[PDB]
Design a protein around this ligand. Structure first.
Ligand code: CDL
Ligand code: CDL
Ligand code: PC1
Ligand code: 3PE
Ligand code: 3PE
Ligand code: 3PE
Ligand code: 3PE
Lengths: 178, 459, 170, 606, 106
């Protein structure tokens, strides 16, 4: 979530993703902790015994066969953490994740209910206003004239500067707003 | 009727003589008073009809339409007085004059006792809505929409004029009560079949019938909010009222001549509900929902059952109210985000809670939640259609299922879900538009409380 | 009670006397006595006050009666005056017949609820009355259409009488 | 005759009062959940009064409060048929909803819209009591649709969740198919008996009622989630746990069973309707027990348990035993209310964690909740002289000892054994074995707002079936002369199911991976019905809509036929007529042609 | 592989600003700036029972007796169970008992 995906997944990343998914489905089958630990050590032994492959064409073939085996032997209802997608509590508080710009449309009475918070909000707004021009200049400088471009973003590289496009990251709503 | 017509006429000098800082206030207040005056037509303590004059009369069918028109005029002013703030004063007064002229001509059309005067006021109502759509519409396609609307209606209405002149030559007066009493049974020849088609096709065009409904979605999309309100809430009902008025002298050949139009209505309401399921434009969705509901009204009027006529009248009033309310809510979102895309604004329940409540209530009215007059009309239409043929229940059930589906799909995709946080220009709410939603919803509640007012001619 | 048992018949109630075998007190009797003393007494007091205020300001209203205008059978065709009078009289009688059917149906529902488990036997006369008035209503008003009128009712009656006369030939 | 009607209308007024308080702008100064809970408990007491009256004298009531409208010969009036069914279900629903309101006050804490949640629950209770107590089918429909819409809102309570919105939408869809059946029945009765009143329906008992009974069966299938229209209930577990409990466990889902109980005098004279109800109920209870065998979400397990019990009630209606079905409605309402409340307490103590694979040792770490969960499981399986004895075992005896379908009987017995099996699955994987939850222990079930409603539902689930069944007026004469294997059948198969499931759970404890089988895949993936149907029917419907209706008709062919073809024809004609060369030689040659043609026309006309 | 120095420094700075923003999300102790108990049985249930129950019971009973019982078929009840040996209150007659019950085996 906090990192952007690359153009393609390398072979090592595909193998590690398969290993983690296989362990999760193995725990979904095993339920009990001791049984899960036994069969997870067996799965780790399988991955270790196929680890040192040098041809890499046979390694891709083994990865394909292992993926076929996983799709044949996966749990129909694997365990999902509640906050994870497909879980029971996933996107539950999106109805409460109100974006911060409605305080701009708040009435002066409602602002008068919270004086100090709105003063600090104005300070954040002024900081954003200066940093926007600074970071637009930085992003224009940092952009390659031609070639390969990814979704990664530069940090602040000088004193008294903020990272570009920091507003929607820093001022995002909390995961438990209430 | 003159006591309603005359001050509505005097609204125009009030509009042109009021100060620019007082025009909206004065015209809105006096149009509300006009509606309150129009409420005196409900004083019907007898089986007779309130024949006020030799050219104006009131009916259990005409009265709810007149009251709805007089009630819709101030609501149209409130709906339209926001997108005209950056507008010239004389153009604002001209727009108000167009709305007032529409209200006057529609009241006269519903209160007319003579079919030639009915046709003259029919075309008289055809003019200023075309002017409104063409002049104050937003996109480029308003000109094509106005042409489609105008010429669908005109090609419908010309054989209606020929048929009315023929019936006047045959009978003598073309007066509604005289025709109703000295009705003669037609001998079912090809000439009488053509006469039937001539006097029914204008109203079927303006209903609209399926296959000839193509003017309605683009006209409602390209029209301004007041034009969409007056169209979807009065003019289709004007077509239905014309069908009910003219069908009394078409016996007996309407019994077999109604067959293609009933099939067109049922399958067209299914098709248009499917279009609502797959439609990317909110105003287009509301327009096609209007097409399906008016197809139900067409089928009831064609089968000519007293239950069908009552359900037709109740569905006319209920659909006028709920379609104007849906158009006003869609126009509030359009004035917010400057787009009509169905999927663009999603999480509006978070930012607009009371407006989401109005959305939910409007959609529940649209899918005929009991005991509302929407369900009353739809249920009695279903009863009469099942009496006409037991196999119509399949088409009715499919239409009801898809109706609930597109209504709840509209609610979920416009209010529920995650909020489109990029829409920084979401002003909280206008008391004007919240008042507009309330002034739509409350008469629905009151007519639900007392449904005897809108039963119509048969009961 | 503004209603009368001639048009809303009701059999006299036959309640049995209480015969409590148990020695336990009856909470229903305790609650009904308490409910009377707490609720029924102030309600009947304020209702008596309202009734005496109405007696102080008493007014009367009457039930309108219409004389019988000549029937449409003696109205010449094309004479819209007498045709209008006969049509209005026919619509008035149609509404009266609708309310007569409502009265009969309400009477039948009351019979069914009163009898309960014995409605298949003890509502025989109510069901017979409902069937007879339904048959008469179907003979006079059915299949007229949305534009029902005295002329259409007369045409239907003439057709039915012609069919009956032709059946009576053989 | 006044205190009875006063108590009924006072139930309705006490229910309507918190709605007016909610819209009356004084919520910010009062404790609205506590006020509504007190309103529900006072409504329950005021409903206990006609319960005692009907237990005394068996008075059967019909109350016409308000006249709505008159349309020729149909007099639509607001009427309530205060029956045995209406009174007993009103009392049970009010007791359950009192427990639900107090549990909601505990559970939906740190929720900004707890007042809206409570108001929605109150609106659902009002519509449910309208549906239960309605005398005419139109008012029945009002309660039916209000219940459906409040179900939609309460499923889509967390409206930022796309899956919650989808579940609410599909519940609306299946309920609308049920509405189509209901409308068919209502229209048939309006046309053939001139009323929607139950008394004229009773007079309609003596003719062919195949079409209205089929419509009522379709409505009951849609509302009670029988086979074909089932999956919206376990999908509808997406809402919060008090919603799940009250709506889909005790009150709403028994409305189709209540409808068929209501129209049982018509149903007794139609053998085909009885046979198809028996077959449908047996099929859905077997299928839903099979689906419940291998689930992991505890709410999903008890939801499929609810659907299996609804199938059992449909079987009981397939036999001519409607009163046993209503008794099972009440007893099952108690069981599922307490079971869902215990599961919700487990979930809140384990921090919104819902599947049984990360639970364990609940008997020792949450003793009160474990005790009440065991009580609920035993009373659901039908341990003797609990609340499940007096309905479920009479149903099993009736199906054993009456002439019915053989396969329906066999799969009903197998479904009862599998009910014991999945109850043992719940007990094992939750209350037994070793802990599997994350280490941070935040269990705190010491709140009286949690303890007291569970205690009241436990007293219900122990004694309520006994009290009710001994106060029931004798009807539907049971048979008691049967062999020993037809008398102890339910107890024997319940014990066998418990032992078989215990052995299977110990085998899962055994350290060995086994290859998965199509039977277990079929059970876990809900019989492939949600995946297959919910992927093929929306795809075909929406694809047909866009690819045929909108595009092909409106945006293509109606435009090609009427307006564009008319414009093309007139454009071609105006080009052909205004293609002049501007030469007066050609114009005068045309004039000469006109002169010749006029002379010819005159010469032939003469 | 691990973080690049680019992404690591960006995440560190973004997280520090997130800490500052969440710290500023706190409330001052004066926030927000807003412009007869007896016992539960004797007082709390008393006024609620006399307000939300008793007065609605009065209004409901008034409507039932003086606007519903005054109408013909509004409140219709089934006939009471009449068993042999009972005495009718309204009529005053005692219906005869049943026969001699020849079976006395259980
Ligand atoms: C027999 C029974 C027949 C009917 C059966 C119906 C079954 C189906 C029910 C569907 C319910 C749908 C639903 O959930 O609606 C939610 C919706 C609002 O719920 P919500 O989601 O919390 O919305 C709050 C906002 O989001 C945020 O607002 P808030 O949180 O600040 O809340 C403040 C509150 C504040 O409420 C108000 O201010 C009330 C507004 C009306 C005041 C009228 C004063 C009249 C004085 C006369 C003197 O606002 C509301 O509650 C909603 C405002 C709009 C309500 C409009 C209701 C109709 C009014 C009709 C007035 C007629 C006047 C004639 C003259 O409530 C209603 O629609 C009303 C309650 C349900 C219907 C009535 C009760 C049942 C029938 C009783 C008979
Ligand atoms: C110790 C204290 C004990 C106190 C005991 C009670 C004393 C007392 O107050 O006695 C009543 C006392 C004297 O009683 P009374 O003289 O024996 O009664 C004669 C009637 O009031 C004569 O009737 P009225 O016409 O003079 O006044 C009643 C009138 C009052 O009406 C108005 O005032 C018009 C509205 C004005 C609105 C202004 C804003 O109501 C109506 O016309 C109908 C109201 C209906 C309301 C409920 C609607 C339900 C709709 C359901 C829809 C769904 C249907 C589903 C069907 C399903 C099955 C097919 O005062 C009144 O009756 C006045 C009550 C005014 C209430 C106004 C607020 C509600 C409207
Ligand atoms: C919106 C739809 C528009 C098209 C359909 C319109 C209706 C179609 C059926 C009716 C025929 C056309 C209208 C006739 C109006 C008068 C009817 C009448 O009085 O009938 C009785 C009369 C007969 O008169 P009569 O009733 O006195 O008959 C005398 C009978 N005896 C002797 C026994 C007493 O019918 C006609 O005169 C009809 C002649 C019509 C000829 C012209 C038709 C032109 C084309 C029509 C459509 C044009 C627009 C669409 C173009 C294409 C667009 C895609
Ligand atoms: C769009 C769908 C059109 C097709 C619908 C399906 C066929 C309908 C056929 C039909 O209208 O049949 C009714 C009637 C039957 O004929 P009959 O009743 O004997 O009339 C004697 C005529 N001298 O038929 C007739 O009287 C013949 C003329 C019917 C014309 C109906 C309208 C046609 C479409 C106009 C647009
Ligand atoms: C022994 C005898 C046995 C007899 C067996 C008889 C079986 C009969 C079966 C009848 C019912 C079949 C049709 C049911 C359709 C249900 C569709 C539905 O609700 O799909 C839900 C689905 C998304 O839900 P899902 O994917 O399951 O879960 C979300 C998890 N992320 O998808 C959606 O939410 C899509 C949104 C809706 C899209 C529009 C749908 C319009 C449907 C119109 C149907 C019109 C015809 C209906 C005919 C009914 C006939 C009964
Ligand atoms: C199921 C029911 C079936 C039966 C009923 C069928 C009939 C239904 C009703 C008819 C509806 C017709 C609609 C006509 C209007 C739509 C056509 C249109 O708008 O054309 C526009 C086009 C000019 O476009 P323009 O604006 O120049 O360019 C676009 C951007 N610059 O315009 C042009 O290019 C030329 C436009 C010509 C005028 C069209 C309107 C008048 C038509 C007169 C018809 C005469 C009929 C008799 C003909 C003689 C006898 C055969
Ligand atoms: C909410 C739905 C409420 C439905 C019942 C409405 C009761 C009020 C009403 O309509 O009263 C009408 C009645 C006059 O009507 P009527 O007797 O026909 O007139 C002849 C004499 N002029 O007028 C009166 O009776 C005036 C006196 C009214 C006194 C208070 C009545 C309170 C009634 C409480 C129970 C209402 C029903 C509860 C169940 C609702 C279920 C949703």
């Amino acid at each position: 979530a906090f990192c952007a995906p690359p153009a393609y997944l390398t072979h090592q990343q595909k193998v590690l993703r398969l290993y983690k998914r296989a362990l999760r489905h193995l725990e979904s089958w095993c339920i009990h902790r001791d049984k899960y630990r036994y069969f997870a050590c067996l799965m780790r032994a399988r991955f270790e015994e196929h680890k040192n492959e040098k041809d890499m064409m046979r390694a891709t073939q083994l990865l394909r066969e292992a993926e076929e085996e996983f799709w044949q032997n996966q749990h129909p209802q694997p365990y999902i953490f509640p906050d994870s997608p497909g879980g029971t509590s996933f996107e539950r508080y999106e109805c409460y994740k109100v974006p911060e710009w409605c305080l701009d449309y708040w009435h002066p009475s409602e602002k008068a209910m919270y004086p100090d918070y709105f003063s600090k909000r104005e300070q954040w707004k002024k900081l954003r206003m200066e940093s926007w021009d600074r970071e637009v200049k930085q992003l224009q400088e940092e952009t390659s004239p031609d070639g390969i471009m990814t979704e990664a973003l530069p940090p602040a590289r000088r004193e008294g500067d903020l990272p570009p496009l920091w507003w929607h990251i820093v001022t995002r709503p909390r995961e438990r707003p209430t | 009727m003159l006591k309603i017509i005359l001050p509505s006429l005097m609204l125009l000098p009030l509009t042109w003589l009021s100060s620019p800082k007082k025009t909206w206030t004065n015209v809105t207040s006096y149009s509300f008073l006009i509606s309150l005056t129009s409420l005196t037509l409900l004083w019907q303590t007898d089986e007779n009809y309130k024949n006020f004059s030799n050219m104006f009369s009131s009916d259990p069918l005409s009265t709810p339409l007149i009251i709805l028109t007089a009630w819709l005029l101030p609501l149209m002013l409130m709906a339209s007085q926001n997108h005209l703030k950056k507008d010239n004063n004389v153009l604002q007064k001209l727009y108000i004059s167009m709305l007032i002229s529409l209200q006057i001509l529609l009241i006269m059309t519903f209160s007319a006792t003579e079919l030639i005067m009915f046709y003259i006021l029919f075309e008289a109502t055809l003019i200023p809505t075309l002017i409104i759509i063409t002049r104050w519409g937003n996109q480029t396609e308003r000109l094509n929409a106005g042409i489609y609307f105008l010429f669908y209606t005109l090609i419908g209405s010309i054989p209606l004029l020929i048929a009315l002149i023929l019936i006047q030559n045959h009978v003598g007066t073309l007066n509604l009560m005289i025709l109703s009493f000295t009705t003669h049974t037609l001998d079912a020849s090809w000439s009488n079949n053509l006469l039937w088609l001539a006097c029914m096709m204008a109203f079927l065009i303006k209903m609209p019938l399926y296959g000839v409904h193509l003017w309605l979605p683009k006209a409602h999309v390209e029209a301004p909010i007041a034009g969409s309100m007056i169209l979807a809430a009065i003019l289709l009902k004007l077509g239905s009222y014309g069908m009910i008025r003219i069908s009394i002298i078409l016996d007996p050949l309407t019994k077999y001549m109604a067959y293609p139009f009933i099939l067109l209505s049922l399958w067209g309401m299914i098709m248009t509900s499917s279009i609502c399921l797959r439609q990317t434009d909110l105003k287009s969705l509301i327009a096609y929902s209007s097409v399906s509901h008016m197809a139900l009204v067409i089928a009831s009027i064609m089968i000519q059952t007293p239950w069908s006529f009552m359900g037709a009248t109740m569905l006319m009033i209920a659909h006028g109210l709920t379609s104007s309310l849906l158009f006003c809510l869609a126009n509030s979102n359009y004035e917010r985000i400057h787009s009509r895309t169905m999927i663009m604004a999603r999480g509006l329940q978070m930012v607009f809670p009371l407006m989401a409540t109005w959305w939910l209530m409007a959609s529940l009215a649209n899918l005929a939640l009991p005991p509302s007059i929407n369900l009353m009309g739809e249920l009695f239409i279903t009863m009469s259609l099942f009496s006409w043929s037991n196999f119509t229940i399949i088409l009715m059930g499919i239409n009801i299922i898809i109706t609930g589906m597109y209504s709840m799909y509209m609610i979920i995709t416009t209010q529920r879900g995650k909020l489109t946080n990029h829409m920084i220009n979401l002003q909280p709410s206008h008391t004007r538009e919240l008042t507009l939603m309330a002034l739509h919803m409350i008469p629905l509640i009151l007519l639900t409380t007392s449904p005897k007012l809108i039963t119509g001619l048969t009961m | 009670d503004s209603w009368d048992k001639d048009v809303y018949p009701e059999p006299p109630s036959r309640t049995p006397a209480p015969s409590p075998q148990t020695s336990l007190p009856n909470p229903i009797t305790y609650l009904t006595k308490a409910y009377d003393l707490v609720v029924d007494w102030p309600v009947t007091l304020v209702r008596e006050f309202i009734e005496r205020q109405h007696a102080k300001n008493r007014t009367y209203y009457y039930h309108r009666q219409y004389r019988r205008v000549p029937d449409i059978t003696e109205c010449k065709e094309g004479d819209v005056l007498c045709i209008y009078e006969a049509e209005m009289q026919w619509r008035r009688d149609f509404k009266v017949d609708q309310e007569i059917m409502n009265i009969i149906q309400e009477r039948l529902k009351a019979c069914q609820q009163r009898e309960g488990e014995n409605y298949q036997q003890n509502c025989a006369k109510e069901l017979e009355q409902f069937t007879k008035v339904t048959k008469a209503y179907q003979d006079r008003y059915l299949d007229l259409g949305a534009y029902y009128s005295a002329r259409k009712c007369l045409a239907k009656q003439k057709q039915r009488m012609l069919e009956e006369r032709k059946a009576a030939r053989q | 005759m006044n205190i009875f009607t006063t108590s009924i209308l006072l139930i309705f007024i006490l229910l309507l009062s918190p709605i007016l308080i909610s819209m009356s702008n004084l919520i910010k100064h009062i404790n609205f959940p506590l006020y509504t809970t007190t309103s529900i408990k006072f409504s329950f007491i005021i409903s206990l009064l006609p319960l005692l009256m009907f237990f005394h004298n068996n008075m059967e009531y019909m109350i016409t409060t308000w006249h709505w409208v008159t349309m020729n010969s149909m007099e639509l009036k607001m009427s309530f048929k205060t029956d045995f069914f209406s009174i007993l279900f009103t009392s049970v629903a009010l007791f359950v909803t009192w427990s639900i309101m107090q549990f909601s006050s505990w559970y939906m804490h740190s929720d900004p819209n707890i007042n809206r949640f409570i108001k929605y629950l109150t609106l659902f209770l009002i519509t449910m009591l309208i549906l239960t107590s309605a005398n005419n089918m139109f008012q029945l429909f009002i309660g039916w649709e209000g219940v459906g819409i409040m179900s939609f809102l309460l499923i889509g309570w967390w409206y930022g969740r796309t899956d919650a919105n989808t579940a609410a939408l599909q519940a609306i869809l299946y309920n609308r198919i049920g509405d189509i059946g209901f409308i068919l029945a209502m229209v048939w009765f309006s046309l053939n008996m001139n009323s929607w009143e139950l008394q004229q329906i009773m007079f309609s008992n003596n003719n062919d009622n195949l079409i209205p009974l089929m419509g009522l069966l379709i409505a009951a299938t849609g509302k009670s989630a029988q086979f074909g229209l089932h999956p919206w209930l376990p999908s509808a577990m997406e809402g919060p746990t008090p919603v799940s409990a009250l709506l889909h466990s005790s009150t709403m889902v028994v409305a189709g069973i209540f409808l068929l109980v209501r129209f049982h005098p018509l149903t007794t004279n139609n053998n085909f309707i009885l046979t198809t109800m028996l077959c449908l109920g047996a099929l859905t209870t077997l299928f839903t027990a099979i689906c419940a065998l291998t689930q992991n979400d505890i709410k999903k397990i008890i939801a499929f348990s609810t659907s299996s019990q609804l199938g059992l009630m449909m079987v009981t209606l397939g036999m001519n035993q409607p009163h046993l079905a209503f008794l099972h409605i009440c007893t099952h309402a108690f069981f599922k209310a307490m079971l869902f409340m215990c599961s919700g307490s487990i979930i809140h103590s384990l921090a919104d964690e819902q599947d049984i694979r990360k639970m364990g040792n609940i008997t020792k770490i949450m003793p009160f909740t474990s005790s009440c969960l065991v009580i609920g499981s035993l009373a659901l399986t039908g341990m003797p002289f609990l609340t499940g004895f007096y309905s479920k075992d009479l149903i099993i005896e009736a199906i054993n000892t009456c002439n019915t379908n053989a396969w329906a009987l066999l799969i009903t017995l197998i479904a009862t054994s599998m009910t014991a099996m999945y109850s043992m699955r719940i007990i094992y994987f939750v209350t037994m074995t070793k802990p599997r939850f994350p280490p941070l222990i935040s269990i705190n079930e010491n709140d009286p707002d949690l303890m007291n409603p569970i205690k009241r539902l436990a007293f219900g689930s122990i004694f309520a079936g006994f009290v009710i069944s001994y106060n029931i007026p004798p009807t539907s004469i049971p048979v008691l002369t049967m062999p020993w294997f037809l008398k102890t059948t339910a107890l024997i198969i319940s014990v066998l199911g418990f032992l078989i499931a215990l052995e299977l759970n110990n085998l899962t404890m055994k350290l060995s991976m086994n290859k998965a089988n199509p039977y277990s895949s079929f059970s876990t993936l809900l019989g492939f019905f949600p995946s297959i149907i919910h992927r093929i029917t929306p795809m075909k419907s929406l694809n047909l809509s866009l690819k045929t209706s909108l595009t092909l008709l409106d945006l293509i062919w109606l435009e090609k036929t009427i307006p564009k073809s008319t414009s093309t024809l007139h454009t071609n004609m105006t080009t052909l007529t205004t293609n002049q060369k501007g030469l007066i030689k050609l114009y005068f040659m045309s004039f000469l042609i006109n002169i010749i043609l006029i002379i010819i026309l005159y010469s032939i006309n003469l | 592989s691990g973080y690049t120095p680019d992404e690591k420094l960006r995440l560190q700075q973004l997280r520090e600003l997130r800490r500052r923003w969440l710290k500023d999300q706190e409330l001052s102790p004066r926030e927000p700036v807003l412009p007869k108990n007896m016992v539960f049985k004797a007082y709390r249930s008393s006024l609620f029972a006399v307000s939300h129950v008793l007065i609605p019971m009065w209004f409901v009973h008034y409507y039932v007796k003086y606007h519903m019982a005054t109408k013909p078929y509004t409140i219709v009840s089934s006939k009471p169970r009449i068993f042999p040996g009972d005495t009718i209150l309204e009529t005053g007659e005692v219906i005869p008992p049943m026969r001699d019950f020849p079976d006395q085996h259980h």
